[PDB]
Design a protein around this ligand. Structure first.
Ligand SMILES: Nc1nc2c(c(=O)[nH]1)N[C@H]1C(S)=C(S)[C@@H](COP(=O)(O)O)O[C@H]1N2
Ligand SMILES: Nc1nc2c(c(=O)[nH]1)N[C@H]1C(S)=C(S)[C@@H](COP(=O)(O)O)O[C@H]1N2
Ligand SMILES: Nc1nc2c(c(=O)[nH]1)N[C@H]1C(S)=C(S)[C@@H](COP(=O)(O)O)O[C@H]1N2
Ligand SMILES: [Cu+]
Ligand SMILES: [Cu+]
Ligand SMILES: [Cu+]
Lengths: 161, 161, 161
């Protein structure tokens, strides 16, 4: 396996219900893969889809961190202002140590692209030796957020181990 | 009534005691009114003044969100570093979901005007279908903070419904 | 004594164990001293070193705030992503009121220097009449963070009294 095991969680009632395909997940996998060396040897080893339900989100984040030994979890979607956007709230429950600088960089860089970046309520932090980062559900958002992180994310992953 | 009901809470021991007039409140109303179309049809339907007392602030934020069906609450003042500045602490108690990107944009844009922007401890978030945003008590601050939000605030209000 | 009493806490297992010298502490003292007038009359009156242990950090922050009447506490180190970096978590337990704008400015300015700024998880806030600010353990980091704060830090200290 890879130096760093990455898992991608798509959070979406629509995808989870089989009402539409996942358009964000593949973009996230592609960005991680294509940045594998810049990330210190990262590979996406697992994906999953959950609905916009705090308990479902918490359960997968806990399992992937505590049991499956993932190193990086990216979540996609559920960070906006609608009532069903609960990804940050689930995330804040599971993380042990907050990582606000990652949020800062994502926001700073995303705002250069679109003012609608301000509507992302993404959270991020560390549980055990797993880094968890919320990204927006727009496919273009993940690539932009990863580019913002890439200069330091390899070192984040080194440090958490 | 309007598409979006806005309420403005001035937080000030001085104004509340009748020791001075409200100079921030009218500026906040003026900025919202003059931006009504950019905001998707917003109108200020109510104002109030409370002292720098956490319970008084909490009570009005809860009433306006839970009973009076306000869509946007702007608070003015009580965000600084003095012992009596408790607006953020009251706000954090009543919000259900944090909206850090709004804080980011307000800070980012305010710092371009004055380094004293860093002394604002404003909070923001959603309770029910009510968006609550703390702004500084300086009259010039509200206009600057609203300009920072205006590119996306209409969509924030659409989403929370 | 000075108008403002400053205390500097170096947080480091290595320094605390006598395994290396403190290289950050002296730089922090030097930056405060050399900025004493810009800070409104600040002087570093005390330093200490603690290990990367939440209880040890909490205890000194509480003592310096509650008993020793310090006005500004700068902590150095323990803000990164390694398991032993627990300074922010200790800090969040002791502060009463968060001061996110200080964190914003430090991050914003630090990112101009190095992308590794995003790996700082520094916290900051007020306890009583004591302002507490976490800075990174890199000696160059303290100078850069203080320069970012200096335009408004005197007024922060005036306000907290
Ligand atoms: N980099 C980046 N960030 C972004 C976007 C984007 O296109 N690029 N879309 C925004 C929009 S349009 C919103 S509504 C929020 C929240 O999205 P979410 O609910 O899908 O997670 O993310 C914002 N963040
Ligand atoms: N945009 C903007 N933000 C601003 C200001 C301003 O003039 N414009 N004044 C600052 C000052 S001088 C302080 S002390 C804090 C806190 O103000 P408050 O306590 O009145 O809420 O807001 C800051 N934020
Ligand atoms: N201004 C500034 N901030 C900075 C740095 C710096 O050199 N200058 N170093 C960074 C690095 S390399 C990391 S790993 C984090 C955390 O450092 P800490 O664990 O020593 O506190 O701070 C970051 N913040
Ligand atoms: Cu959107
Ligand atoms: Cu001020
Ligand atoms: Cu580092």
């Amino acid at each position: 396996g890879p130096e760093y095991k990455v898992a991608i969680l798509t959070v979406s009632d629509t995808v989870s219900a089989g009402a539409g395909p996942d358009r964000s997940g593949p973009r996230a996998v592609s960005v991680v893969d294509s940045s594998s060396e810049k990330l210190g040897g990262a590979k996406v080893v697992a994906t999953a889809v959950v609905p916009d339900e705090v308990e479902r989100i918490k359960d997968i984040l806990q399992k992937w961190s505590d049991v499956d030994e993932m190193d990086l979890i990216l979540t996609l979607g559920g960070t906006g202002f609608t009532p069903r956007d609960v990804t940050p709230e689930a995330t804040k429950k599971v993380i042990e140590r907050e990582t606000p600088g990652l949020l800062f960089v994502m926001m700073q860089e995303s705002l250069k692209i679109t003012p609608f970046a301000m509507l992302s309520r993404s959270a991020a932090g560390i549980r055990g030796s797993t880094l968890i980062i919320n990204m927006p559900g727009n496919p273009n958002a993940v690539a932009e957020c990863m580019e913002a992180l890439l200069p330091a994310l390899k070192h984040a992953l080194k440090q958490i181990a």
